[PDB]
């Protein structure tokens, strides 16, 4: 499914992610945004090390979810990263709530960096009644 910018906003806020640990609204957006295009069937494939990331966080199959195809999988969400693929994105923010919970936050994710970080990102979620 790809979901319109203020329905995401408003699916997400429902899910809790505003202002989990320290990060607003804006700055989720704004990652999947960047990572998808908001888009739950986005998959990428990463030739060098053989992980793919998975739906509209492009979650790593190397760390978080399991695939069974990628060399020394962790599985930290204890998910199949078929979870990560459906339109219901409950299963996506459980394990992204997961990966911010270490250490490094939202900076796990590099494209949140690239794009969101330093940046007047207000713009994602203006209009949507959030």
């Given at each position: ?14 899910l ?7 990060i607003?609204?804006?700055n989720?957006?704004c ?5 998808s295009?908001y ?13 793919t990331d ?7 199959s190397r ?17 199949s ?7 219901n994105?409950?299963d996506?923010?459980?394990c992204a709530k ?15 960096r ?13 209009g949507?009644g959030?």
């Open positions: 499914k790809v979901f319109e910018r203020c329905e995401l906003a408003r699916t997400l806020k429902r809790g992610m505003d202002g989990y640990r320290g607003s609204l804006a989720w957006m990652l999947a945004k960047w990572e295009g888009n739950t069937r986005a998959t990428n494939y990463n030739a060098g090390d053989r992980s998975y739906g509209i966080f492009q979650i790593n760390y978080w979810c399991n695939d069974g195809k990628t060399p020394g999988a962790v599985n930290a969400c204890h998910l990263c078929s979870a990560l693929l459906q339109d994105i409950a996506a923010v459980a997961r990966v911010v919970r270490d250490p490094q936050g939202i900076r796990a994710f590099v494209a949140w690239n794009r969101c970080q330093n940046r007047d990102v207000r713009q994602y979620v203006q949507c959030v």
